[PDB]
Symmetry: D2
Subunit: 497 residues, 4 copies
């Protein structure tokens, strides 16, 4: 059946990235189900390590490892088996009492912290991947809009002329720093707490480095209390999500204002807009508002997690609040949605230029010209130009129609004196494109300057992608090593022992 | 007059670090007054840079720079002069209209963002210094308590034997990672947005690198929109404060429980306790609870800042919530207080050992011994030992009095079968010190293992202090370079122009 | 299969209320699925009202109403039909184009706000019911513990003697005020926004009172903008949940400390405790910590909702954050759990009395006796008694062994003078039960005073239950009236038109 | 000296209400200094009550009461005397040891909770007064704009025609419910905890009702634990502030969008706008953004307070976070500012009408007319009118120029069939004023309907003011009774004893 929301001005299908905003809530796993497959990997890595340490024989190890595959399969459809003690009991019912030996030297506490880290680790790479895709859309969009003159706003008022490319490279710089935040967090998430057992380690001679390496961790959470009590990485994950999403909310809000009926300086692609069941004229920025909704919602986990940490001791505690799958899923959906919003955004170039030329954002350049040309101080020139604007608005004179006569009157009105500048001086100062070209320093909207930022961002994106590929490959390599090791044990036992 | 709170069991004076918790609220500056001296430095750096760029003559520069000193002096007692436009107007009244030229190419927006960064930069070094002092107290305390056997808790229940040194090194590892968070944040705070002007740069040929260098920044916030709209570093500063303080709350809570009348395993130094105006018996953990109060309060700025960022566009906005001096001051007071709390904490070594030996935290080692000795699986041994405990509690038998007869009865009761272990096996398994010695892996409480962590932490603290000294010296060097440059201009003009 | 967590000291089954804490997360509905059945009721009420208004004929109404039952049935298994436009389209495919007439004068905006209110209304009655059950457990528990002498704490230090009944009646008074908060909120939730349509009403002659009455609302959200933009009730619902749960967290924390191995003044019923997979001695307060977890998590929705309201205009907005089913479900589970925790809590009466008699909580009465008997001011008596305690602790003298000689020495040591009180005066002042009996004013722990509070609370609980029964019956009556009306239309059309 | 910010387009002085936003931060009292005068009242009320109870003689009472005046005077300039134990010690140094008797039966705990309640009580009446003034401005503004046709927005897109009066009465209804929230809170704040002493009452025969009555409380916090541990009213105060301010943020945001350069449908009074130090054209909505800033900041205390309550037991705790004066001061400043913003807002009536007539907000009425006139279902009419809009936008045809030919083409294009409506039918459906007049039900924008809401709101405002006058007079009466009683004691002792 058709998408019944695609009626009237909501033509065609929702963009896939837009549809993600509708699907993640019902599709989200519980934390228990999301972490369960990582627990299964931990069982295997732990058992392999115990085998290397001689705590388990190869025969016992093979029996357990084969059982783990069988219980994993049962648990694919039986959710009751996805927490540890039910899982262990099912393993015991499957292979016998040797099942219990897989917990030697181990706790639910270090198992759980490690499993959640593995989950968050994968979700952090998933997030970094999405943020990179978002930055790619932003920078690649900017590269096409070096000449798209438009006003920048401060305090929701037209400030000065820039370009759309200039604006998008602000977002790129924001995302560059959020990627740093996420990679910095990744180094703290990707630490293995296994071997802490309950909170104090164990007398069993575990090799904590081997379990860590088998599970793709880059290091250990060393202190055993820190290994089970430590939760700051969960709080930090929630925070970076929240602050990253606050910037995504701000872009969404920016574009929503751009695409108001009143601004009309940009239009959402049809595939990122919805309509109204009652008002046929609506082209609703539903992608933007649902993206903002996720940003706002991300405040929740951050506060809950920090509240729970403020409520306890420096202990393992079952009262700690988690970062849950549905929260991350919402971030990914919003990030994907805004990636497509940016990619497909349709700027109204003509109206953007009209506002820049007509609505007085060029008055700074008029002021700077008076200082540069006649040498008066900035504050006196400012007062003259403000009077130019006040008078211009009163007389209905758009900025690009301000001439020598109006400027001289304002100078005389505020100063008693004329001012020695030409009509050409004023014309060039009020030309919004010349406003852009004159702003040619580092980080300023002149095409040459924005292009330099794009080049730099393109080189940084290459490093972003390389960092992600390296982190991902390290995990894939370890997971394959673990699988090989499991198979070796099971098969050697079957054929030779 | 005497400290009227030092009555009854609140003997002697408050520790200075404890007193800090009482003073910071009334003493805290407003953000305006805290940032004002940095604005004054920015005026000088900006003016020097304009002079290098030939935008100001040396004569104009000298006149302004001399005026800045005069207005700074007026503003020391006249708070109305500490915001920019009143300050500029006072400068104009002091030296004449040339005062206005100091704003060429500049805005309140990039001035304010830069000034707040300079404030937060200094406050971040102040915070890093305090966190290092806190970690030093923790590690140096741990070094004296390698042999201080005591129980670790999970879920506020006695879990297993550790040592006080082992526990403190959990905190050290937490603080190591919070110092990473803060240094990572410092690299983002210490970026100069000057030259962004209103939000789009300027046509004036500023040298943004020179202003940045004169003000001790390590780099630029490049994009001019990012330079004025960017606020994530403020949110991040608030977050690291909050998460760092949540760990400080947890230690404070831990110690508060240790020092309850019922636990009695540690006692606060008198200089960190208060008493009651009514109940003469009270030795109140007032340092701890006021430290937790600050931790809880630090949630506030984090939420307000993120809320404000979620509420706007990617613009300069006057609606953004700030991180205020009093919030940082509270963190410093709480950190200093807990530094002294830890340094002077008096553990009850005898009672710590008593609990470890008597209240069943050794049962894991009993369980592990059954697995290691008779080869049963962990789950069956666990069930036997649980019955040992249940029976022991019922009969009023402390853990260190559990013997062969009680263990065999439990084995028979739960299994129908005895178990082939000796009274010596049980004795050694129940010896809490042997529990500690057996836990000799990485991050575990055995003195050799905790000592290894202390050695590592001591080497890391040397690097922490070196990083702080280098960051501080860089700022001091730049501030002196700026002062030299100002004096050169003023004096050259006075004597030679 | 057995509950694999019920091993060792976790004997028997989890209490049903305890199990609720494990089930609500996987069982929680999405908001869409939770609100859908209320949307179906709204369709019927709206259509009936349109029929009364002559906007629909009885024949059209019957056709639609019969279709609504058919689509409702499809939607029981097809989740795609639970949002409005897909539902309407399925209705159109089921009965023809007349399906579209059910939206005359209506929007998704007032439909959605009304449906969510109906959901929250039912969930608020569900919550009030649970809070009443919680208060009933607290008061009925208190009634059995008028004589259960124990210490009250301030700042986690023993303060003065009370009774367990006295403590529980603090919770009762807290819950009384939270029930007021919830009933006050109910009056704002139970207002009907239908008729606001998109945000400005409609030219169709709706009878907004009839739709409201058919749906059990007690009044209208009058202004049509307020009807769709209004969200404060959602924020308020989240807040009362959060503050109510913060008090539940505090009781859970209180009991957790009571039931520490070190306090040992209360023990959780086995059916509300868990154990450890590794440490056989653990009787873990898992009901308490998971209850606190829900309290902490409830901060999340409150902050997200308020953030979203701070981010928008006074408009209908799709960016607003919702209060979701799983959040309320968590509150109900925690409230039920703590209801059973309180009901089945096992106080250690002997140890409670021991602490009261031995650990110096009686020193206030000693101080008051010196003031009352010899007329010295409170501050000088306080200083004497503090010295009594200091000396007593040093000499290992429990409070109930403090005698005339020790009190006189302290008086002489601090004053140079003895004090004219008898050994009987001191004995009676240090008798913890006499401490309780002397505290006989309003709200104080004397059995006569606590009994008076219980009587009052029992009368208030009768009114709580009456208020809930009346609110519930009003909704049941309206729902039956609506069902009758639907059937009348369908059947009259089938048989007579 | 002149207000140096009143330059260029920032003409005249800041409105006084606008200036409040600049002054409250530096002017805010600490909580200690704000509560101190209430503590002094409590000392007097407590001492008077002790005198009535015969615990103090009239002679002792007079001596203390006279001393309280002397220490109060010292404390006006010596901030160290504003906490209890220093104050008591200064009283002792002033009148002798009898000073200590004023604490008989009392604690810092019930003193502090009571003093903070008295502070919050007065601040709640101050807040209710400001909210009433805000509602008065809103309703009185609405009364002048029954005919000010303009579009209402949903999702920041033009939705349907309303009037400015209609919009303002949404705010009135919001404020009516926030006033209910505040008055409901007032009944819980205005409860006296005195007599709880430390947390368990006292053996002294206090008359808790007399102290409560002398201090203007309407009832007791009965249970003595609740009297000192109870804090929910602080959380609730913070919440109502936050949710009330979120609605104020939304109006501020709404007006900010109205007053963008692009909407230009309203203009702030000059006295509520600022300008830029660099951009002479700026008329900045600084009142609005600083008002939103306060709304966002109010999230902070709410989260800190709730966090602290989630962190402790149901005890008196010094870790609880307070609601501080500066937070309330910010709310009052923002409320006053927005009161003046609303009062002096200048709507652009001509442009408001232009948008309503031209930008397609009338399309719903076109759709409803097709349903009403030719009997097609709403969904098919909707699809036709959407095509009308799509075509109209493509051809540059403003809504008020849509005619029969365009509607028939759309009908044929989407249906293959024309539609039997007249040019007059279409004209009347597209007349934005007729859109308003047709929306004549309860809460809809027709002048008759908005006038009815204004009449109701005016009657409700009379009751709001009466409730405030009654609450205020009750406190003034009690304060005068207390002063009379103090004077009677002091003077009777001086002249007759
Ligand atoms: O387009 C949507 O996602 C939802 C719209 C609505 O329910 O109003
Ligand atoms: O779907 C609706 O009924 C309305 C949507 C809107 O407000 O645009
Ligand atoms: O010792 C203090 O800081 C405060 C105590 C109190 O006011 O209760
Ligand atoms: O200072 C008091 O009155 C009480 C303090 C306490 O609760 O310990
Ligand atoms: O289940 C465990 O492994 C441990 C639980 C605990 O810390 O008590
Ligand atoms: O500092 C500014 O940008 C403006 C402040 C104001 O007008 O309040
Ligand atoms: O005061 C300024 O420099 C700029 C203000 C603005 O962004 O409008
Ligand atoms: Na971490
Ligand atoms: Na940043
Ligand atoms: Na409401
Ligand atoms: Na309350």
């Amino acid at each position: 059946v058709p998408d019944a929301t695609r009626i009237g001005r909501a033509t065609g299908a929702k963009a896939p990235e837009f549809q993600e905003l509708y699907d993640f809530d019902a599709a989200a796993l519980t934390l228990t189900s999301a972490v369960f497959p990582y627990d299964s990997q931990i069982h295997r890595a732990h058992v392999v390590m115990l085998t290397e340490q001689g705590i388990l024989t190869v025969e016992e190890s093979a029996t357990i490892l084969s059982g783990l595959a069988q219980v994993d399969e049962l648990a694919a459809t039986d959710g009751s088996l996805r927490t540890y003690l039910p899982y262990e009991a099912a393993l015991k019912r499957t292979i016998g009492s040797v099942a219990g030996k897989m917990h030697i030297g181990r706790s639910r506490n270090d198992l759980a912290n490690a499993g959640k880290r593995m989950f968050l680790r994968d979700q952090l790479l998933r997030t970094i991947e999405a943020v990179i895709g978002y930055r790619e859309a932003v920078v690649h969009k900017a590269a096409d809009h070096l000449d798209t003159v438009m006003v920048v706003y401060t305090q929701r008022k037209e400030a000065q002329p820039i370009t759309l490319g200039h604006y998008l490279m602000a977002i790129s710089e924001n995302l560059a720093k959020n990627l740093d935040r996420y990679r910095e967090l990744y180094a703290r998430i990707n630490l293995c707490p296994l071997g802490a057992a309950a909170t104090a380690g164990t007398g069993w001679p575990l090799n904590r480095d081997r379990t860590s390496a088998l599970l793709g961790f880059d290091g250990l959470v060393v202190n055993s209390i820190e290994g089970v009590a430590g939760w700051d990485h969960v709080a930090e994950h929630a925070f970076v999500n929240a602050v990253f999403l606050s910037g995504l909310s701000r872009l969404a809000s920016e574009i929503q204002l751009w695409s108001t009926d009143e601004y009309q300086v940009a239009e959402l692609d049809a595939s990122f807009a919805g309509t109204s069941s009652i008002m046929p004229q609506k082209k609703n920025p539903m992608s933007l508002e649902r993206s903002r909704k996720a940003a706002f919602a991300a405040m929740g986990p951050l506060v809950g997690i920090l509240t729970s940490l403020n409520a306890i001791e420096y202990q393992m505690s079952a009262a700690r609040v988690e970062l849950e799958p549905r929260s991350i899923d919402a971030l990914i959906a919003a990030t994907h949605a805004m990636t497509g919003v940016v990619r497909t955004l349709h700027p109204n170039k003509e109206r953007m230029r009209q506002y820049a030329a007509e609505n007085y954002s060029t008055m700074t350049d008029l002021t700077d010209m008076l200082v540069r040309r006649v040498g008066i101080d900035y504050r006196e020139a400012h007062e003259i130009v403000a009077h130019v604007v006040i008078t211009a608005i009163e007389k209905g004179i758009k900025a690009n129609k301000i001439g020598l006569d109006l400027v001289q009157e304002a100078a005389v009105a505020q100063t008693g004196a004329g001012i020695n500048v030409s009509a050409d001086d004023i014309k060039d100062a009020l030309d919004p494109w010349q406003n852009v070209l004159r702003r040619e320093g580092k980080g300023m909207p002149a095409p040459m300057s924005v292009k330099a930022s794009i080049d730099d961002a393109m080189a940084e994106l290459h490093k972003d992608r390389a960092w992600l590929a390296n982190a991902t490959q390290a995990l894939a390599n370890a997971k394959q090593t673990l699988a090989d090791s499991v198979q070796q044990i099971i098969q050697t036992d079957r054929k030779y022992l």
